[PDB]
Amino acid sequence: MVDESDKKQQTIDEQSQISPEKQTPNKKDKKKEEEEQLSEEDAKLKTDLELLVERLKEDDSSLYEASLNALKESIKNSTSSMTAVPKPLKFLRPTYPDLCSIYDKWTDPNLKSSLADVLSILAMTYSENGKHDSLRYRLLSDVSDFEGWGHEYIRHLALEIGEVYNDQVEKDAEDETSSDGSKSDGSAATSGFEFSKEDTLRLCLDIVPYFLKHNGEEDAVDLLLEIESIDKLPQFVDENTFQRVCQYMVACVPLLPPPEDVAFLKTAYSIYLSQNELTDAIALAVRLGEEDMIRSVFDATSDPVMHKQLAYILAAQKTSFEYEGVQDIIGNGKLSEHFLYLAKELNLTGPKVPEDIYKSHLDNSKSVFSSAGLDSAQQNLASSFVNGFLNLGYCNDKLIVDNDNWVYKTKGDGMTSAVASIGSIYQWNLDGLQQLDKYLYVDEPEVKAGALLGIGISASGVHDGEVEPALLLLQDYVTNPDTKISSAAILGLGIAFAGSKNDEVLGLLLPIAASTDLPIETAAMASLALAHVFVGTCNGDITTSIMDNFLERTAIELKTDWVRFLALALGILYMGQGEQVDDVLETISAIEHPMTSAIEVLVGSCAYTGTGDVLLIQDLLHRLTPKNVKGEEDAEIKSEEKKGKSSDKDATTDGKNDDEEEEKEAGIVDELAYAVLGIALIALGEDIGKEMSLRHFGHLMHYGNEHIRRMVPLAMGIVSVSDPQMKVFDTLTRFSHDADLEVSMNSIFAMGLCGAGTNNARLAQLLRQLASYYSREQDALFITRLAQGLLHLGKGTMTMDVFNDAHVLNKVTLASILTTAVGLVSPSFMLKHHQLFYMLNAGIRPKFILALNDEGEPIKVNVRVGQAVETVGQAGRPKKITGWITQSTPVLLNHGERAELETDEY
Amino acid sequence: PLTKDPVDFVRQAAMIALSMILIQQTEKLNPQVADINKNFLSVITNKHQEGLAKFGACVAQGIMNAGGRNV
Amino acid sequence: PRMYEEASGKEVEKVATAVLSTTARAKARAKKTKKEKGPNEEEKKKEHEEKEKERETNKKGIKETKENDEE
Amino acid sequence: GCWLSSVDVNTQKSFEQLNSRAVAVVVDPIQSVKGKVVIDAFRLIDTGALINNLEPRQTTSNTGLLNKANIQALIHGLNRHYYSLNIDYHKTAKET
Amino acid sequence: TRCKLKLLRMERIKDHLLLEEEFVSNSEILKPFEKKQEEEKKQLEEIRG
């Protein structure tokens, strides 16, 4: 540390830790005197650069401050940075660290502020030279180790960030702001950024996303594509490149408004398209939901290759995976056009092959019944629906149904729903139609209606490739003018085709959904189907539905039930979109009535989704307001009011669920806690408000995909036993269903206690019973999830009927709806060219460890399990493929996606 | 200081004294008066006042704005 | 007299502060929202019209002056 | 401390009958150290006085102050079965 | 940097949000009842002493 003069080169470094002589005195004098020393100075630059490099290792604040103290003065005092022009400009290499030594090593509040500003200006000027880039690189990839640079280097980068962010917040932009003093664009700093990006992408991660989101343009993102696609395999594997891209997009989700957020993810998809894995591609194309992107990934494998090859089989598999079946329709018929084999291809895209595979699973899972034996009165009705709720998905329980004794004892609305529950035994099945036909041709109009609903449920799994479409059976019923018949018909068509907006399905449904002048309660089903049809893909926000919602309001207000259902159908209709939905809020609002104000708060949730935190504060100001106005003073109306209140509550919950899913997984925990504070606030304040919020809560959980399932449903249940509306219990059980037999062990005992114990009304008893049976599928037959499964950010379509029904006080009419519950998940299996029905092995891990992804790709260590096991629910979702040791290679990366595994053996 | 005096009856005496000096003065003319009326209002509102404190605030306000705000 | 009746204003003050405190809790998100928000208003409508926003209307900081008859 | 038990209320009651107004002075001489502390007078409260609020007519037309020697002990019987009012001392100058 | 930010965004906003709502609602529990749930409180406090 102490001076020890010029005895050797080692002590020369020691000499200059206190006072330089080759950087201070000499150079200074030369620059401030002769200008032939401009020449000596040029050779001496090199020498000066080296002396920094040696003393970098020294960290003490004092022996960098003071040493280079007078050089800092010299920028403006003696050189004035233009006494010899070019020569200070290229001599700014070493003077730039001097400035940084006062910013960062020494902290003097007054100078650290002021000199930030100086540093920015000079970073720009010296980046024309493109030597400011090299200054940055020698600290980024390092030469020496000291604590100092680990803090310093962030500042250099921070200058760039500073300015670029501010141009969004202040409109004046550029170097007019004296906060940076540096021009936002121009061909001088732009070339600096590209070069900076290169070096920081290789070694670090920090600044590469910041630059995009501050520019705000899809253009920044498209430069990223170019560089990264070079890096795809020779610099590091496919896998690594993928984890970065989606880390950028998933982390900045909350702060991207609608138009910006679609526009960013386009570019992530395309990055994926360029790179080797098309498996990564298909998954993003789905995110977006655009038709246009699905077709390019399906095409890319089908059209080039003339031969059948792998290429045709792979296309079909990929579209087959969404059980919204939006992809199914689009991809079909290309297979026909190419004509290698019609027969294999067409069946494989279709959800027809997914039935067959189900039989393999069922075989392990066997049949255990646990149905109610109770007969007579409303208890007869209870039991007969309960039989279907336990044997959901493909089950065979034929014989029981054929015992028409119990079937016929159902009465009224119970008769329609009884036939409708039968349909769910043969849910997702070709066969079963038979059972339905017998009744349809005999007795009262009631059994006829109930038959059509069940057809709807059965047809869920066979409605493509023009193999018994539901459209075929149900058209005849629409023509028949009786209302019950016709209403039932369009409810089942809508369910079956789901997202599929095929020409025949859609267009049958298009003149119609346009008569509401005649007063008919059950015509809720007119719009309710079409909304369901619409979800799963980008919306037109159809002009049929929007016109009819308004017309109904003109005509009637008497049927409160009719208009509450209508209001919801509109909000469910706009699902699948958000950009276009900002428009329709206004359109709806043009016409203003207190009755119209109920419709708006609902729709607000779908437009603002995916950036909502304004939406949140809004759905809370609403809540407060009835009470609040009353608060100030203290120190026909019936129908309008009730719609008002009830809507808000639904809307708050919908909003939350959708935001938490897409946004940070962390945030899922916080939103549940906020809900509990909303309900507590309501239980005291309004008597009427409390009723609605109970029911909403169960679907809050099921939608949001809470991580915790053990504690919260149970605890909540207990308070709400005292509280009226036993329909609460059904909404909780749809969350609790989980991986059957994990959560649900606790559940059957907890739901069962209140039911069995208390009987004080059979009306009350009926809700409780149904809820119980729903929850469990015997020896893990299937799992229901609101989510796609294929994305875990994803949202379903078939599960939207479940989500609709928790807005109204319970009704026997409502029971009929409730039978419908669709939303299956397939069990993965390794496929072969002879279609092997068995998994070899898999890893499962309750909890991912990776913190690079918030999703968390599977670890490669896991805990090992056997063949032919259901893809586990929570605390088992991360799934890795074990097969590599038997010399087998996945073609279809599975991370715990719905998708079936597929393998190629060497 | 006598206004906040921990001994109860001292406080009684003090409240009445204050409005006696500042009997009907304008609340622009003296900021002072406007403060003093609110002091009274809170003493009666608050149930952690003694009965003698309550006695002084009520008489004092009656002096303070006596005559129908004329005398 | 002056006002001295109140017990209805409690409500309005409560929801009035809540919103501003919510802005602080929401901030992390808010900035990303803000970058989107500004250009979208300049293109479209600020809030129904776009007159006078050059400063915050056309003035900055304090816009107040001292009084010479009150207090 | 100065308080009253049930047995002493029964004793109290009959002096009240004999002489309409009468007092009970209760001396606790081993919590007394200034010859004046833990000595209070007490007097019966009627059952009519509690329910029809004719209890605090003794807070009016007097000083209206009550000075506690035992905070805990007086307050308990102050609503239950007595009203306490403060004690004073006197002498003529011959006595002094 | 982007991976941390994504988690940090969701967990801070909701938790901070759940906090702020508890503040507003807590006051608001009290106003509905004043003699409908209040009665049990008065009787316990007197018996307990």
Coordinates of N, CA, C and O in Angstrom, one line a residue, chain A residues 220-346:
Chain A
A220 N -38.5 -4.4 -30.4 CA -37.4 -4.8 -29.6 C -37.3 -6.3 -29.5 O -36.3 -6.8 -29.4
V221 N -38.5 -7.0 -29.3 CA -38.6 -8.4 -29.1 C -38.1 -9.1 -30.4 O -37.5 -10.1 -30.4
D222 N -38.5 -8.5 -31.6 CA -38.1 -9.2 -32.9 C -36.6 -9.1 -33.3 O -36.1 -10.0 -34.0
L223 N -35.8 -8.1 -32.7 CA -34.3 -8.2 -32.7 C -33.8 -9.3 -31.8 O -32.8 -10.0 -32.1
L224 N -34.5 -9.7 -30.7 CA -34.1 -10.7 -29.8 C -34.1 -12.1 -30.5 O -33.2 -12.9 -30.1
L225 N -35.1 -12.3 -31.3 CA -35.3 -13.5 -32.1 C -34.0 -13.8 -32.9 O -33.5 -15.0 -32.8
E226 N -33.5 -12.9 -33.7 CA -32.3 -13.0 -34.5 C -31.1 -13.6 -33.8 O -30.5 -14.6 -34.2
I227 N -30.7 -12.9 -32.7 CA -29.5 -13.3 -31.9 C -29.7 -14.6 -31.3 O -28.7 -15.4 -31.4
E228 N -30.8 -14.9 -30.6 CA -31.0 -16.1 -29.9 C -31.1 -17.3 -30.7 O -30.6 -18.3 -30.3
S229 N -31.7 -17.2 -31.9 CA -31.8 -18.3 -32.8 C -30.5 -18.8 -33.4 O -30.4 -20.0 -33.7
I230 N -29.4 -17.9 -33.4 CA -28.1 -18.3 -33.6 C -27.7 -19.2 -32.5 O -27.1 -20.3 -32.7
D231 N -27.9 -18.8 -31.3 CA -27.5 -19.5 -30.0 C -28.1 -20.8 -29.7 O -27.6 -21.6 -28.8
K232 N -29.1 -21.3 -30.4 CA -30.1 -22.3 -30.2 C -29.6 -23.7 -29.8 O -30.3 -24.4 -29.0
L233 N -28.4 -24.2 -30.3 CA -27.8 -25.4 -30.1 C -26.3 -25.3 -30.0 O -25.7 -25.9 -29.0
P234 N -25.5 -24.5 -30.8 CA -24.0 -24.6 -30.6 C -23.6 -24.0 -29.4 O -22.6 -24.5 -28.9
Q235 N -24.2 -22.9 -28.9 CA -23.8 -22.2 -27.7 C -24.3 -22.8 -26.5 O -23.6 -23.1 -25.6
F236 N -25.6 -23.2 -26.5 CA -26.2 -24.1 -25.5 C -27.4 -24.7 -26.0 O -28.1 -24.0 -26.8
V237 N -27.8 -25.9 -25.5 CA -28.9 -26.6 -25.9 C -30.2 -25.9 -26.1 O -30.4 -24.8 -25.5
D238 N -31.1 -26.5 -26.9 CA -32.4 -26.1 -27.1 C -33.1 -25.6 -25.8 O -33.7 -24.6 -25.8
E239 N -33.0 -26.5 -24.8 CA -33.7 -26.4 -23.5 C -33.5 -25.1 -22.8 O -34.4 -24.5 -22.4
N240 N -32.2 -24.6 -22.8 CA -31.8 -23.4 -22.1 C -32.4 -22.2 -22.7 O -32.8 -21.3 -22.0
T241 N -32.4 -22.2 -24.0 CA -32.9 -21.0 -24.8 C -34.4 -20.9 -24.5 O -34.8 -19.7 -24.3
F242 N -35.1 -22.0 -24.4 CA -36.5 -22.0 -24.1 C -36.8 -21.4 -22.8 O -37.8 -20.6 -22.7
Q243 N -36.0 -21.7 -21.7 CA -36.3 -21.3 -20.4 C -36.2 -19.8 -20.2 O -37.0 -19.1 -19.5
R244 N -35.3 -19.1 -20.9 CA -35.1 -17.7 -20.9 C -36.3 -17.0 -21.5 O -36.9 -16.1 -21.0
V245 N -36.8 -17.4 -22.7 CA -37.8 -16.7 -23.5 C -39.1 -16.5 -22.7 O -39.6 -15.3 -22.7
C246 N -39.6 -17.6 -22.1 CA -40.7 -17.6 -21.4 C -40.6 -17.0 -20.0 O -41.6 -16.5 -19.5
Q247 N -39.4 -17.0 -19.4 CA -39.2 -16.3 -18.2 C -39.4 -14.8 -18.4 O -39.9 -14.1 -17.5
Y248 N -39.1 -14.2 -19.7 CA -39.2 -12.8 -20.0 C -40.6 -12.5 -20.0 O -41.1 -11.4 -19.5
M249 N -41.4 -13.3 -20.7 CA -42.8 -13.0 -21.0 C -43.6 -13.2 -19.7 O -44.5 -12.5 -19.5
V250 N -43.5 -14.4 -18.9 CA -44.3 -14.7 -17.8 C -44.1 -13.8 -16.6 O -45.1 -13.3 -16.0
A251 N -42.9 -13.4 -16.3 CA -42.5 -12.4 -15.3 C -43.1 -11.0 -15.5 O -43.4 -10.5 -14.4
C252 N -43.2 -10.5 -16.7 CA -43.7 -9.1 -16.9 C -45.2 -9.2 -17.3 O -45.7 -8.2 -17.8
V253 N -46.0 -10.3 -17.0 CA -47.3 -10.4 -17.4 C -48.2 -9.3 -16.8 O -49.1 -8.9 -17.5
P254 N -48.1 -9.0 -15.5 CA -49.1 -8.0 -14.9 C -48.9 -6.6 -15.5 O -49.9 -5.9 -15.2
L255 N -47.9 -6.2 -16.2 CA -47.7 -4.8 -16.4 C -47.8 -4.6 -17.9 O -47.2 -3.6 -18.4
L256 N -48.4 -5.5 -18.6 CA -48.6 -5.4 -20.0 C -50.1 -5.2 -20.3 O -50.9 -6.0 -19.8
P257 N -50.6 -4.1 -20.8 CA -52.0 -3.9 -21.1 C -52.3 -4.8 -22.2 O -51.3 -5.3 -22.9
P258 N -53.5 -5.1 -22.5 CA -54.0 -6.0 -23.6 C -53.3 -6.0 -24.9 O -52.9 -7.0 -25.2
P259 N -53.3 -4.8 -25.7 CA -52.7 -4.8 -27.0 C -51.2 -5.2 -27.0 O -50.7 -5.6 -28.0
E260 N -50.6 -4.8 -25.9 CA -49.1 -4.9 -25.8 C -48.7 -6.3 -25.5 O -47.9 -6.8 -26.1
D261 N -49.5 -7.0 -24.6 CA -49.3 -8.3 -24.2 C -49.5 -9.4 -25.3 O -48.6 -10.3 -25.4
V262 N -50.5 -9.3 -26.2 CA -50.6 -10.1 -27.3 C -49.4 -10.0 -28.2 O -48.9 -10.9 -28.9
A263 N -49.0 -8.7 -28.4 CA -48.0 -8.3 -29.3 C -46.7 -8.8 -29.0 O -45.9 -9.1 -29.9
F264 N -46.3 -9.0 -27.6 CA -45.1 -9.5 -27.2 C -45.0 -11.1 -27.3 O -44.0 -11.6 -27.7
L265 N -46.1 -11.7 -27.0 CA -46.1 -13.2 -27.1 C -46.1 -13.7 -28.5 O -45.7 -14.8 -28.8
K266 N -46.5 -12.8 -29.5 CA -46.4 -13.3 -30.9 C -45.0 -13.7 -31.2 O -44.7 -14.7 -31.8
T267 N -44.1 -12.8 -30.8 CA -42.7 -12.9 -31.0 C -42.1 -14.1 -30.2 O -41.3 -14.8 -30.8
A268 N -42.6 -14.4 -29.0 CA -42.1 -15.6 -28.3 C -42.5 -16.9 -29.1 O -41.7 -17.8 -29.1
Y269 N -43.7 -17.0 -29.6 CA -44.1 -18.1 -30.4 C -43.2 -18.4 -31.5 O -42.8 -19.5 -31.8
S270 N -42.9 -17.2 -32.3 CA -42.1 -17.3 -33.5 C -40.8 -17.8 -33.3 O -40.2 -18.6 -34.1
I271 N -40.2 -17.4 -32.1 CA -38.8 -17.8 -31.7 C -38.8 -19.3 -31.5 O -38.0 -19.9 -32.2
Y272 N -39.8 -19.8 -30.8 CA -40.1 -21.2 -30.8 C -40.3 -21.9 -32.1 O -39.7 -23.0 -32.3
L273 N -41.0 -21.3 -33.1 CA -41.2 -21.9 -34.4 C -39.9 -22.0 -35.1 O -39.7 -23.1 -35.7
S274 N -38.9 -21.0 -35.0 CA -37.7 -21.2 -35.7 C -36.8 -22.3 -35.2 O -36.1 -23.0 -35.9
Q275 N -36.8 -22.5 -33.8 CA -36.0 -23.5 -33.2 C -36.5 -24.8 -33.5 O -37.6 -25.0 -34.0
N276 N -35.6 -25.8 -33.2 CA -35.8 -27.2 -33.4 C -37.1 -27.7 -33.0 O -37.8 -28.3 -33.8
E277 N -37.5 -27.4 -31.7 CA -38.7 -27.9 -31.1 C -40.0 -27.0 -31.4 O -40.1 -25.9 -31.0
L278 N -40.8 -27.7 -32.2 CA -42.2 -27.4 -32.6 C -43.2 -27.7 -31.6 O -44.3 -27.3 -31.6
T279 N -42.8 -28.6 -30.6 CA -43.5 -28.9 -29.4 C -43.7 -27.7 -28.5 O -44.6 -27.5 -27.8
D280 N -42.7 -26.7 -28.5 CA -42.7 -25.5 -27.7 C -43.6 -24.5 -28.4 O -44.2 -23.8 -27.7
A281 N -43.7 -24.6 -29.7 CA -44.5 -23.8 -30.6 C -45.9 -23.9 -30.4 O -46.7 -23.0 -30.3
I282 N -46.4 -25.2 -30.4 CA -47.8 -25.5 -30.4 C -48.4 -25.0 -29.1 O -49.5 -24.4 -29.1
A283 N -47.6 -25.2 -28.0 CA -48.1 -24.7 -26.7 C -48.3 -23.2 -26.7 O -49.3 -22.7 -26.1
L284 N -47.4 -22.4 -27.3 CA -47.7 -20.9 -27.3 C -48.8 -20.5 -28.2 O -49.5 -19.6 -27.9
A285 N -49.1 -21.3 -29.3 CA -50.1 -20.9 -30.3 C -51.5 -20.9 -29.7 O -52.4 -20.1 -30.0
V286 N -51.7 -21.9 -28.9 CA -52.7 -22.0 -28.0 C -52.9 -20.9 -27.0 O -54.0 -20.5 -26.8
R287 N -51.9 -20.4 -26.4 CA -52.0 -19.3 -25.5 C -52.7 -18.2 -26.0 O -53.7 -17.7 -25.4
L288 N -52.2 -17.8 -27.2 CA -52.7 -16.6 -27.9 C -54.2 -16.7 -28.2 O -55.0 -15.8 -28.1
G289 N -54.6 -18.0 -28.6 CA -55.9 -18.4 -29.0 C -56.3 -18.0 -30.4 O -57.4 -18.3 -30.8
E290 N -55.4 -17.4 -31.2 CA -55.7 -17.1 -32.6 C -55.7 -18.3 -33.5 O -55.0 -19.2 -33.4
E291 N -56.7 -18.3 -34.4 CA -56.8 -19.4 -35.4 C -55.5 -19.7 -36.1 O -55.2 -20.8 -36.5
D292 N -55.0 -18.5 -36.6 CA -53.9 -18.3 -37.5 C -52.6 -19.0 -37.2 O -52.0 -19.7 -38.0
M293 N -52.2 -18.8 -35.9 CA -51.1 -19.5 -35.4 C -51.3 -21.0 -35.2 O -50.3 -21.7 -35.3
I294 N -52.5 -21.5 -34.9 CA -52.7 -23.0 -34.8 C -52.3 -23.6 -36.1 O -51.5 -24.6 -36.2
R295 N -52.9 -23.1 -37.1 CA -52.7 -23.7 -38.4 C -51.2 -23.7 -38.9 O -50.7 -24.6 -39.6
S296 N -50.3 -22.8 -38.5 CA -49.0 -22.8 -39.1 C -48.2 -24.0 -38.5 O -47.4 -24.6 -39.3
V297 N -48.4 -24.3 -37.2 CA -47.6 -25.4 -36.6 C -48.1 -26.8 -37.1 O -47.3 -27.6 -37.3
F298 N -49.4 -26.9 -37.3 CA -50.0 -28.1 -37.8 C -49.6 -28.4 -39.3 O -49.4 -29.6 -39.6
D299 N -49.5 -27.3 -40.1 CA -49.2 -27.3 -41.5 C -47.7 -27.6 -41.7 O -47.4 -28.2 -42.8
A300 N -46.8 -27.1 -40.8 CA -45.4 -27.2 -41.0 C -45.0 -28.6 -41.0 O -44.0 -28.9 -41.7
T301 N -45.7 -29.5 -40.2 CA -45.5 -30.9 -40.3 C -46.3 -31.6 -41.4 O -45.8 -32.5 -42.1
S302 N -47.6 -31.1 -41.7 CA -48.3 -32.0 -42.6 C -47.9 -31.8 -44.1 O -47.7 -32.8 -44.9
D303 N -48.0 -30.6 -44.6 CA -47.7 -30.3 -46.1 C -46.4 -30.6 -46.7 O -46.5 -31.2 -47.8
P304 N -45.1 -30.4 -46.1 CA -44.0 -30.6 -46.9 C -43.7 -32.0 -47.4 O -43.8 -32.2 -48.6
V305 N -43.7 -32.9 -46.4 CA -43.4 -34.4 -46.6 C -44.6 -35.0 -47.3 O -45.7 -35.1 -46.8
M306 N -44.3 -35.6 -48.5 CA -45.3 -36.3 -49.2 C -45.7 -37.6 -48.6 O -47.0 -37.8 -48.5
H307 N -44.8 -38.3 -48.0 CA -45.0 -39.6 -47.4 C -45.8 -39.4 -46.1 O -45.7 -38.3 -45.5
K308 N -46.4 -40.5 -45.6 CA -47.0 -40.6 -44.3 C -46.0 -40.4 -43.2 O -46.2 -39.4 -42.5
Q309 N -44.8 -41.1 -43.2 CA -43.8 -40.7 -42.2 C -44.3 -40.6 -40.7 O -45.4 -41.0 -40.3
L310 N -43.6 -40.0 -39.8 CA -43.9 -39.5 -38.6 C -44.8 -38.4 -38.6 O -45.6 -38.2 -37.7
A311 N -44.7 -37.5 -39.6 CA -45.2 -36.2 -39.8 C -46.7 -36.0 -39.7 O -47.2 -35.1 -39.2
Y312 N -47.5 -37.0 -40.3 CA -48.9 -36.9 -40.2 C -49.4 -37.3 -38.8 O -50.4 -36.7 -38.3
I313 N -48.7 -38.3 -38.2 CA -49.1 -38.8 -36.9 C -48.9 -37.7 -35.9 O -49.8 -37.5 -35.1
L314 N -47.8 -36.9 -36.1 CA -47.5 -35.9 -35.1 C -48.5 -34.7 -35.2 O -48.8 -34.3 -34.1
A315 N -48.8 -34.3 -36.4 CA -49.8 -33.3 -36.5 C -51.1 -33.5 -35.8 O -51.6 -32.7 -35.0
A316 N -51.7 -34.7 -35.9 CA -52.9 -35.1 -35.3 C -52.9 -35.1 -33.9 O -53.9 -34.8 -33.2
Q317 N -51.7 -35.6 -33.3 CA -51.6 -35.8 -31.8 C -51.7 -34.3 -31.3 O -52.4 -34.1 -30.3
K318 N -50.9 -33.4 -31.9 CA -50.8 -32.1 -31.4 C -52.1 -31.5 -31.3 O -52.4 -30.9 -30.3
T319 N -53.0 -31.6 -32.4 CA -54.3 -30.9 -32.3 C -55.3 -31.5 -31.4 O -56.1 -30.9 -30.8
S320 N -55.2 -32.9 -31.3 CA -56.0 -33.7 -30.5 C -56.0 -33.3 -29.0 O -57.1 -33.3 -28.4
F321 N -54.9 -32.8 -28.4 CA -54.6 -32.4 -27.0 C -55.6 -31.4 -26.4 O -56.1 -31.6 -25.3
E322 N -56.1 -30.3 -27.2 CA -57.1 -29.4 -26.7 C -58.3 -30.1 -26.9 O -58.7 -30.5 -28.0
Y323 N -59.1 -30.2 -25.8 CA -60.4 -30.8 -25.6 C -61.5 -29.8 -25.5 O -62.7 -30.1 -25.4
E324 N -61.1 -28.5 -25.8 CA -62.0 -27.5 -26.2 C -62.3 -28.0 -27.6 O -63.5 -27.8 -27.9
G325 N -61.5 -28.7 -28.4 CA -61.7 -29.1 -29.7 C -61.8 -28.0 -30.8 O -62.3 -28.2 -31.9
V326 N -61.3 -26.8 -30.4 CA -61.2 -25.7 -31.3 C -60.2 -26.1 -32.3 O -60.5 -25.9 -33.5
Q327 N -59.0 -26.7 -31.9 CA -58.0 -27.1 -32.8 C -58.5 -28.3 -33.7 O -58.1 -28.4 -34.8
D328 N -59.3 -29.1 -33.1 CA -59.8 -30.3 -33.8 C -60.4 -30.1 -35.2 O -60.2 -30.8 -36.2
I329 N -61.3 -29.1 -35.2 CA -62.1 -28.7 -36.4 C -61.3 -28.2 -37.4 O -61.4 -28.7 -38.6
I330 N -60.3 -27.3 -37.1 CA -59.5 -26.6 -38.1 C -58.6 -27.6 -38.8 O -58.5 -27.6 -40.0
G331 N -58.0 -28.5 -38.1 CA -57.0 -29.3 -38.6 C -57.5 -30.4 -39.6 O -56.8 -30.9 -40.4
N332 N -58.7 -31.0 -39.2 CA -59.5 -31.9 -39.9 C -59.6 -31.5 -41.3 O -59.9 -30.3 -41.6
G333 N -59.5 -32.4 -42.3 CA -59.9 -32.3 -43.7 C -58.8 -31.9 -44.5 O -58.8 -32.2 -45.7
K334 N -57.6 -31.5 -43.9 CA -56.3 -31.4 -44.6 C -55.9 -32.8 -44.8 O -55.2 -33.2 -45.7
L335 N -56.3 -33.7 -43.8 CA -56.0 -35.1 -43.8 C -56.6 -35.7 -45.0 O -56.0 -36.6 -45.6
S336 N -57.8 -35.3 -45.4 CA -58.6 -35.7 -46.5 C -58.1 -35.3 -47.9 O -58.1 -36.0 -48.8
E337 N -57.6 -34.0 -47.8 CA -57.0 -33.4 -49.0 C -55.8 -34.1 -49.4 O -55.8 -34.5 -50.6
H338 N -54.8 -34.4 -48.5 CA -53.5 -35.1 -48.8 C -53.8 -36.6 -49.2 O -53.1 -37.1 -50.1
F339 N -54.7 -37.3 -48.6 CA -55.1 -38.7 -48.8 C -54.0 -39.6 -48.9 O -53.5 -40.0 -50.0
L340 N -53.5 -40.0 -47.7 CA -52.5 -41.1 -47.7 C -53.4 -42.2 -47.1 O -53.8 -43.1 -47.8
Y341 N -53.8 -42.0 -45.8 CA -54.9 -42.8 -45.2 C -55.8 -41.8 -44.6 O -55.5 -40.8 -44.0
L342 N -57.1 -42.0 -44.9 CA -58.1 -41.2 -44.3 C -58.4 -41.7 -42.9 O -58.4 -40.9 -41.9
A343 N -58.5 -43.0 -42.8 CA -59.1 -43.7 -41.7 C -58.4 -43.6 -40.4 O -59.1 -43.4 -39.4
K344 N -56.9 -43.6 -40.4 CA -56.2 -43.5 -39.2 C -56.2 -42.2 -38.7 O -56.4 -41.8 -37.5
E345 N -55.9 -41.3 -39.6 CA -55.7 -39.8 -39.3 C -56.9 -39.1 -38.7 O -56.7 -38.4 -37.8
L346 N -58.0 -39.3 -39.4 CA -59.2 -38.6 -39.1 C -59.7 -39.0 -37.7 O -60.0 -38.2 -36.9

